[PDB]
Design a protein around this ligand. Structure first.
Ligand SMILES: Cc1cc2nc3c(=O)[nH]c(=O)nc-3n(C[C@H](O)[C@H](O)[C@H](O)COP(=O)(O)O)c2cc1C
Ligand SMILES: [Mg+2]
Ligand SMILES: [Mg+2]
Ligand SMILES: [Mg+2]
Length: 179
C-alpha cells in the first residue's frame, strides 16, 4: 500500500480510530491499521506516506511498558527506527487523550511523536485548530495549533468521525487521497 497506518494503544481506542481511518480507503491506498508492537523497522521504513496514531498515557508519556501498558508500544518502537532518515516522506499524526483528566498534559505524546519525525526530516502535514478543546497545556501545540489531529474519546467521542473526515480532507492533497 501507498500509506502506512500505524498506532499504539493500551485500551483499544487508538486502534478503533485507526480502523475508522482505514475503512475509508482501499488496500492499494492504505495498509490495514498496524500496531507498532507488531511491525519491523524495515516494514515501517518502506512507506513514503505515514499516518501515525498514539494516546498519551502515564502522565504525558508514549504508550509502552514504562507507562504501565500491557505490551510494548511506541516507547520501544522508536529506538528501532531512530537511525533512519525520514526526508522526502510525508507524515500525518493523530493523538488521543483526555483533556478533562489531564488538562496540563493533553496529547503530550502526540508532541513527542511529532518531534521524533520532524527532527529526522519528515514533512509533517495535518495541523489542527485548538478550537473546541478545553485544556491548560499541551506539548502537541506548536504556533497556536495542534501538530496533528486532536481526539478525545473520553469526553468527545461523538465528534471523532467529523474530525477525522475533515482532517482527511485537509491532508488529502498531500496524501493523494480521494474522498
Ligand atoms: C493512566 C492513564 C494516563 C493518561 N494520561 C494522559 C495524559 O497524560 N494526557 C492525555 O491527554 N490523556 C491521558 N490519558 C487519556 C488516554 O490517552 C485516553 O483515555 C485514550 O483514549 C486511551 O487510548 P487507548 O485506548 O488507545 O490506550 C490517560 C489515561 C490513562 C488511563
Ligand atoms: Mg484505488
Ligand atoms: Mg491486506
Ligand atoms: Mg540503537
Amino acid at each position: 500500500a501507498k500509506i502506512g497506518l500505524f498506532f499504539g494503544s493500551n485500551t483499544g481506542k487508538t486502534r478503533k480510530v485507526a480502523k475508522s481511518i482505514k475503512k475509508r480507503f482501499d488496500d492499494e491506498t492504505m495498509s490495514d491499521a498496524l500496531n507498532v508492537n507488531r511491525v519491523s523497522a524495515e516494514d515501517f521504513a518502506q512507506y513514503q506516506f505515514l499516518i501515525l496514531g498514539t494516546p498519551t498515557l502515564g502522565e504525558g508519556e508514549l504508550p509502552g511498558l514504562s507507562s504501565d501498558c500491557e505490551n510494548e508500544s511506541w516507547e520501544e518502537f522508536l529506538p528501532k527506527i531512530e537511525g533512519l532518515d525520514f526526508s522526502g516522506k510525508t507524515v500525518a499524526l493523530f493523538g488521543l487523550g483526555d483533556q478533562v483528566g489531564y488538562p496540563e498534559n493533553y496529547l503530550d505524546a502526540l508532541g513527542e511523536l511529532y518531534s521524533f519525525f520532524k527532527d529526522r526530516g519528515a514533512k509533517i502535514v495535518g495541523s489542527w485548530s485548538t478550537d473546541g478543546y478545553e485544556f491548560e497545556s499541551s506539548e502537541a501545540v506548536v504556533d497556536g495549533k495542534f501538530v496533528g489531529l486532536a481526539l478525545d474519546l473520553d469526553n468527545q467521542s461523538g465528534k471523532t468521525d467529523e474530525r477525522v473526515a475533515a482532517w482527511l480532507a485537509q491532508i488529502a492533497p498531500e496524501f493523494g487521497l480521494s474522498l
